[model samples]
Target chain A: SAPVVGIIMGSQSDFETMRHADALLTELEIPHETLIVSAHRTPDRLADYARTAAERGLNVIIAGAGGAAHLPGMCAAWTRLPVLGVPVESRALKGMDSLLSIVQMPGGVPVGTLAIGASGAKNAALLAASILALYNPALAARLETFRALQTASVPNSPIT
Target chain B: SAPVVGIIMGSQSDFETMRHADALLTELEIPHETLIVSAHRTPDRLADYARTAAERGLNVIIAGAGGAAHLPGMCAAWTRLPVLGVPVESRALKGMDSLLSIVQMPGGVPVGTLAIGASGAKNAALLAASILALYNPALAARLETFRALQTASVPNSPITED
Candidate 1:
């Protein structure tokens, strides 16, 4: 299957945050790819990869970055395809900077941002699958099953 | 000045989150008190504390906790005083549970929940002081000065991309 989701991290340090993205995408059986492409660190690859992603049959882009995480916004700027941004938790503010940077995008460019840290990463994957599911009915069915399993797991009371 | 703002945390873990609370309170020159009371570990202390908070001359309460952080919500459940909830960043979810648990209160019960972690903690202090500033004209002046300073720091072209 052609790669549908691209999970790009800002730096190698961001692997810890991006791990949750991997975990969720794996569970969804989505053909995804991960990379250490930083908008600041490697501008050439960042521009090149983003520019060609959609032409290459990439349906959704899940960009997870920490610190001054600008990959998602920049990628969204370069590519017209929907971008799901996971604000990888930062050391100082626990990803609040990352969260605000991702969520508070300017009017025109939109990035479907998730919560900070692991939950955000997980949600980014789920949101990616959700978007991809629009064209692929089987993926939609799989996503519904995943959501049902999640709903069923919620207990009447917090477990002792 | 009598303590008008009350700061309570669910556990010692919140000290990491509440440090900003102490800083902001000092900056605003607000007389306040801090407590290591819990909703689960020490539910009795929580009840007693909330029930008597307004009577003790407290105008506002800033409560912070992580995980299933029910301290702020539980406090509001016991007191008529306005409670500001700071969703301390959790170890697992980084305080989403804390944020939802505090912010998603029933229709009547209100917990003015802030952002999360230190910013949230700092805002909780500022909000508490802002409320008390309704009566304390001095604190109101300080807040106005602070707001002016913040507004002045906005750059003409802030770094967004690259």
Candidate 2:
């Protein structure tokens, strides 16, 4: 199937956190493509990818990075498509730097930021899925089931 | 002034936000000192300042920084005194980076973090004053008056845009 969502990261290092988004997208059966796209090191590639994303049939972009994470904001700068950011945990700042760099996009541009580490990655996939589901009836039904089951799995009491 | 509170910042750039704390402390008549103490650039100064804060008659330390924003955490690491943090807004992230950097302590250490920007600075001073109020009756009454007047000053309704 043609990809509607693109999961991109600053480096292969970011893949550890981004894999959660990939796995969740796969589970939801949402067609998405994953790639290594650095904002600082490979600005040209990011410019082209983001600029061409809509015409290339990508509806959403999930970008993950750590330590001065600038990938998502730059992506949003180029494309009009909804961009979700995952702040991958860093060695020194523990993703605080990444979270700020991604979350704070000022006023003109926007990058919907999520929590740090794997939780952020997983939530970004879910959020992207929700966006696609708006025009996608089949995906809406699938996502609803995912949500229903998630709520159903929670326990009322804790074990000793 | 014989300082009871010390407000430290990473650089003069941070003074834009930290000055709010300084002004608020002055308004409250809380004796305090302000200085530049970068965690990365002036590590030695920070160590001595934080280590001796209590012995030198300081009751609280309010530290502010942008970018990596490590001053507050490192200050807490060295001091037994209550250390409050203000995340000065940055040109890039608008202080979200500063907020997380100041607030998220891993464990075995703590920094009572305030909101980002001037509001945070103001509140850090108010919070520090509250701590001091526990011991000094005069300051406690002044803080009460401050809080009362602040509450009283808010309007019930907003002016129409028209």
Candidate 3:
């Protein structure tokens, strides 16, 4: 199946975080493609990729980057599809810079900012699934089961 | 305000939240100064103000802003004093952007981050009191009383609804 979601990061280093989004999408049986597209080094590529996303049948975009992250915002600037951002942890600031830079996009172009690091990537995939599920009943059912299992798996009392 | 704890904001709109920090400091009898300092629009002023803060006998700094929130980080970059950050709520992201912007400073330059909006503002003042309390026995007792009252005020269980 052609990919429905595009998970793009700034550099190969970002794959450490973006991979979680890719894995979650796969586990959910959601067809998706993961690639590296730097917003700063290759603005033209980001513009082209995001502009053609909707026409190419992509429903959502998950962009992750560290430090002064602009991948998600710049991607949102080009595409109308909902863009979710993951702040890949940085060496010095620990992804605080990445989180701030990705989020806080101007009002018109909004990026749904997630938490920093691996958790954000997973949540982005789950959120993308929920959005896709709004139209597809089978996906909606699968997502429901996933959530139910997650809820049941949590222990009632503290482990300690 | 004798200016022991400095509370600064970007614009008057930010005062809506920052005012909470101000009120808390006042309740604790901690003299402090509140002012407007734009990191982008007035860099020189921020440089001068923060550079002079330590000599001015200011114990701590509380800075808050929304959007590309840089006030707290910029303030920390200049001063050695402990800087606390409050992420003011914004129109678009509701302070997620603000929270990220403030909380994530470089390793050497640190800004102690608090929760978003009014709660953060209030906590910054309460936290500032705790820090100052280490040096002053009188302030420490007052904070204890405040904590005791706060503890007494909480209900163990929530009221049921029909």
Candidate 4:
């Protein structure tokens, strides 16, 4: 299927965290492509991908990075399309460094940031789907179903 | 008196969040200095400050930044000093970005991360004092006193919508 969402991360190590986004997108039945795009190590690739993303038919971009984690913000600077950022947990500071790097996009550019690590990655996919669901009735329905199941999964009261 | 703790941030705007650290440090009577040190904008300043931090008699560094916060991590990279990071809430993401930027460090360098926004800033100061209290027995006693007061401040039961 033609991909509407572009999922990119800093390195292969990030694949562990970014896969959560892939899993959710698959579960939601949204078409998305995943790739390794580093802001620091591979700046040219990031610029090229971000510049051509909209023309390539990508409606949203989800970027995950650890450490200096600048992929998402740099991507947002290149594209007009909405970008979602997932902060992969790093070895030292955990995912806090990644989260801040992605979320703090000055003024004009905006990257909707999720939580840290796996939870953040999952939310990025859901948020991307929510964005697409604006004109996509079928996806909207699926999202609603997913939300209901999620809400129901929570226990009503804490057990001893 | 010589400052033992150094509280720094990217911009003056960060003072809103970093001030929590200042308030706590002041309450604990820990001598500390606050400054604006941007990693991207003031790379030289960051390098100088971090490199000279230990020699300057600073034991712990609490750094706060909101967006693309490289201050805390960069500081950690420059010095052997234990650095604590506070992620200031940003306009777009509300500090989640800040939290990640500060917390995620490579193997050798380390930056102790805290919660997002004000809570994180507050904890950074406490953690720094905890580190300092190891050498200063009086400060350790004061920290214990503060913790006891904090424990006493919390309510045992949750209130319903009061």
Candidate 5:
């Protein structure tokens, strides 16, 4: 299992958000790698990593960054491989800047944008696994199982 | 055509975001009612207004609020009618609180949450018209025309660096 997915965070601080992506990917037994690659702190490394993602056997990339997040968009610009963006909820905007920066990708270059914070990161992995599962039958079966579990988990009529 | 759509802002301040909803509705020639009904400031009024919205003959509701946006969720709780929430970019969380609060409505309650800021507001009105158009064929034709004109207006190679 040569790391099918890459979960790169802008900083260690993003762990709080990006961890959700990690957990979901792990649950599906998908080998994935996590790293600290910031768009603002180290733009060159971000570019280099993204540019080579597909060649390196990584099928999907989930980038989580906050506060004027440029990681996901830049990654999309560099790679043809699907990139999922997680807008880490920050102090000021709770990730609105991150969300808009990610979701509003220009026409052709697509970054499957998810919601901000934990849900987004978690869904990013699930969605990435889904994209990969499209090509991997075993992964697809696991995803279907996950979906069944989720559907079963629904209790109906407001559990709040 | 009386205002069939009601656009309620959580605060007088939300007029900025809520305005786009009104503008889109206007462009679509859909009658809409706009108001400053803060869920926190005027809970009683908010409840009264939502409780009677359907009976008052209003077809759609677009509620825009920020921070701990109780307005959208509360409105949904009160009405069976379809509710669209526009998370007005707040001072602290920039509307993420509003977005999650609205979108992750407990299993039974559903709020068709839209993006934050101007685009979301515009879409809210558009979504409202689309929902109402389920019954209004003429409006559906007008909406299709509006969308065509909108798409036709876009420039190719639409990337912007500035």
Candidate 6:
């Protein structure tokens, strides 16, 4: 099947964060594609990608960016598809800037913002999987299994 | 004497979060002013405020905003003053988006970001007071006392939230 999710990052270096989403999507058996599409550096490419995402058979888009992160918001502006934002950590402010830029959208547009850095990326994938699972019963079952495994992994107390 | 710190937010609604900074500054006895300065809705006012802030004798700026919170970043852009950012809990994302937009700045411009929501606001005030205390011995003594009191407030065990 063609990829149902599109995972785009602001920079190639963002793979360190975006890969968490990629791994989760893979484990959940969700077909997805990951790419670099900078909002500031490559505005035209981002515009084209977002505008055409749904037509290209993408159900959801997860965009990650660090520092002045306009990728996710800009993507949401272009597409009506449910866009999930992952704030990649930057060197100076440590991803706090990325999180705000992605999460704080105007009233009209909406981007489902996640936590900063790795956890955000992981949750973005899980959220995207959940969005897709609404239509795909098979994927829904896999997600349930994944959640069960995750729940089972937690311990009752601190481990030395 | 002019205020040493300026606490500004994008809207009056932000007062809910920015008040923590206000209360902290009050506790530290730091003379400060709190106002609304929207970056997008009031760009000209922001420009005027930032451009003249240092000249007006404000040493530090603590700005809070939610959503596409550009106020703090824009303030840092316009002035050389030390800017601290507090990400207000937004309606949708719970300040995560506000945190990123404020903290992430290109080189040469910096907005020291704090934790999200109320604690972030409180810390912004504390951080601003610390910055000012560097030049004032009396303020430094007061800050030490504040820290000691804060330390005393923490208990050895976690309390149940009923």
Off by over 4 Å in 2: A1-160
Model 1: residues >4 Å from true position, as ranges? B1-162
Consecutive 10-residue window with the lowest summed lDDT within model 5 chain B: B103-112
TM-scores, in order shown?
A: 0.51, 0.54, 0.55, 0.56, 0.53, 0.56
lDDT of 1 by residue, B4-112 (tens): 7889998777998898888888887888888898999999999999989867977678898988989987896776566777777877887777766765554334455
The regions of model 4 sitting more than 4 angstroms off are A1-66, A70-103, A107-160, B156-162
lDDT for residue B76 in candidate 2, whole number 0-100: 80
| Selected candidate, larger DockQ, 4 vs 6 | 6
Instruction: Tell me the tens digit of each residue's lDDT in model 5 across A14-100.
Output: 998898789988999999999999999899999999988867978778899998999987886776555667888889887878877
The DockQ scores of all candidates, in the order shown, are: 0.02, 0.06, 0.09, 0.22, 0.03, 0.23
lDDT for position B85 in model 3: 93
Per-residue lDDT over B1-162 for candidate 6, one digit per residue giving the tens place of the 0 to 100 score = 568899999888999989999999999899999999876566557768988999999999999988887778767767889999998888877876787677666656688999998899999988898888889999999999999998999999997897
The DockQ-based CAPRI class assigned to model 6 is incorrect
**Model 2: per-residue Cα lDDT at residue A155:** 96
Candidate 2 at residue A97, lDDT? 76
| Counted clashes in each candidate structure | 2, 0, 0, 19, 1, 15
Clashing pairs in 1: A90-A95, B90-B95
lDDT of each: 0.73, 0.86, 0.86, 0.85, 0.75, 0.85
lDDT of 1: 0.73
Chain B TM-score per candidate, please.
0.93, 0.96, 0.96, 0.94, 0.93, 0.95
- Report the lDDT tens digits of candidate 2 across residue range B1-162: 789999999889899999999999999999999999976556557768987999999989999988656678768867888899999888866777778767765445578999999999999999999999998999999999999998999999999996
Q: What is the Å distance of residue A117 in model 4 from its true position? A: 17
Error of 3 at B103 (Å): 0.9
Compose the digit string of candidate 3's lDDT tens values, residues B1-162: 468899999788999999999999999999999999875455457767887999999989999888767678767767889999999999877888788777865456678999999999999999999999999999999999999999999999999999
Per-residue error at A83 for model 4, in Å? 18
Query: After aligning candidate 5 to the native by TM-score, how far in Å is the CA of B7 from where it should be?
Result: 0.5
Q: By DockQ, is 3 or 6 better?
A: 6
Q: Which 10 consecutive positions of candidate 6 chain B have the poorest summed lDDT?
A: B38-47
